[PDB]
């Protein structure tokens, strides 16, 4: 049978993203809009910095900007915590430690408002070097594929993950962003607590040639894979 959560994602779902950020005291906001198609694990989103110039590089916000759109293969459906929490939704929290630089702390609520899947985020960044790779805008505008190991967090009735993102720099090195993540449901309803599994990501960043505002276009695919060999 198709679960309550699963049925909310059988077609194309509009997405709205709102972020309020503050990094080393530099305040900024970003809105995003687009669509998710969970059947294909597909996200298409365009983000606009509504406060002027984004004071951090767009790539550093990609992981922050809706894992309910992941494609879970049929044999993996029991492990999809993210859809099981809908429509009431879940809180996603991270600390992202940039190696040799500062860290982001994020809190996002992901939930439906009517037919729209909303990702509402607050982000606070501290201890950044004003001329480091982040505040100095030294990251290439691109993105690597990454696998994320999702684990159940029984104590907290949700999931957790930690993974390292590599942001390429043009001198051939990378800026590491070490993610520690915890998701917990917003409703008191039943959720799926998964066995350990992976989510495989690819992300492509681009620009709208007709857009004068500071912005990012993101195309991202997420697919789950199991550990039964
Ligand atoms: Br600060
Ligand atoms: Br605007
Ligand atoms: Br950028
Ligand atoms: Br995602
Ligand atoms: Br988050």
UniProtKB/Swiss-Prot annotation:
Tissue expression profile of the protein: Photocytes.
Subunit comment: Monomer.
Family: Belongs to the GFP family.
UniProt biotechnology annotation: Green fluorescent protein has been engineered to produce a vast number of variously colored mutants, fusion proteins, and biosensors. Further generation of mutants led to more stable proteins (at 37 degrees Celsius for example) with brighter fluorescence and longer fluorescence lifetimes.
Result when mutating residue 143 to F: In Sapphire/H9-40; exhibits a huge Stoke's shift, with an excitation peak at 399 nm and an emission peak at 511 nm. In Azurite; shifts the excitation and emission spectra to shorter wavelengths and increases quantum yields compared to BFP
Outcome when changing residue 204 to K: Abolishes the tendency to dimerize and leads to monomeric fluorescent proteins
Effect of residue 169 to V: In EBFP1.2; shifts the excitation and emission spectra to shorter wavelengths and increases quantum yields compared to BFP
Effect of residue 65 to L: In EGFP; increases fluorescence at warmer temperatures such as 37 degrees Celsius. In EBFP; gives rise to variants with blue fluorescence
Effect noted on mutating residue 196 to S: In EBFP1.2; shifts the excitation and emission spectra to shorter wavelengths and increases quantum yields compared to BFP
Impact reported for residue 143 to A: In Cerulean; leads to improved quantum yield, a higher extinction coefficient and is 2.5-fold brighter than ECFP
Organism this protein belongs to: Aequorea victoria
Result of altering residue 144 to I: In ECFP; leads to cyan fluorescence, folds faster and more efficiently at 37 degrees Celsius and has superior solubility and brightness
Keywords: Chromophore, Luminescence, Photoprotein
Effect of residue 148 to I: In Azurite; shifts the excitation and emission spectra to shorter wavelengths and increases quantum yields compared to BFP
The protein's name: Green fluorescent protein
Consequence the record notes for mutating residue 145 to P: Increases fluorescence at warmer temperatures such as 37 degrees Celsius
SS bond partners: none
């Amino acid at each position: 049978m198709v679960s309550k959560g699963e049925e909310l994602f059988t077609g194309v779902v509009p997405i709205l993203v709102e972020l309020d950020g503050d990094v080393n005291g530099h305040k900024f906001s970003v809105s995003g809009e687009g669509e998710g198609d969970a059947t294909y694990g597909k996200l298409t989103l365009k983000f606009i910095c509504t406060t002027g110039k984004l004071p951090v590089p767009w790539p550093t916000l990609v992981t922050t900007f809706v894992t309910c759109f992941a494609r879970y293969p049929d044999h993996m459906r029991q492990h999809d915590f993210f859809k099981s929490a809908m429509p009431e939704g879940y809180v996603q929290e991270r600390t992202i430690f940039f190696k040799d630089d500062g860290n982001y702390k994020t809190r996002a609520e992901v939930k439906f408002e009517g037919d729209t899947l909303v990702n509402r985020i607050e982000l606070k960044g501290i201890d950044f070097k004003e001329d480091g790779n982040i505040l100095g805008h030294k990251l290439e505008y691109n993105y690597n594929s990454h696998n994320v190991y999702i684990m159940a967090d029984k104590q907290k009735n949700g999931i957790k993950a930690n993974f390292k993102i590599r942001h390429n720099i043009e001198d051939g090195s990378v800026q590491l962003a070490d993610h520690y993540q915890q998701n917990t449901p917003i409703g008191d309803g039943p959720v799926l607590l998964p066995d350990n599994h992976y989510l495989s990501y690819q992300s492509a960043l681009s620009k709208d040639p007709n857009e004068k505002r500071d912005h990012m276009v993101l195309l991202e695919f997420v697919t789950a894979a199991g550990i039964t060999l």
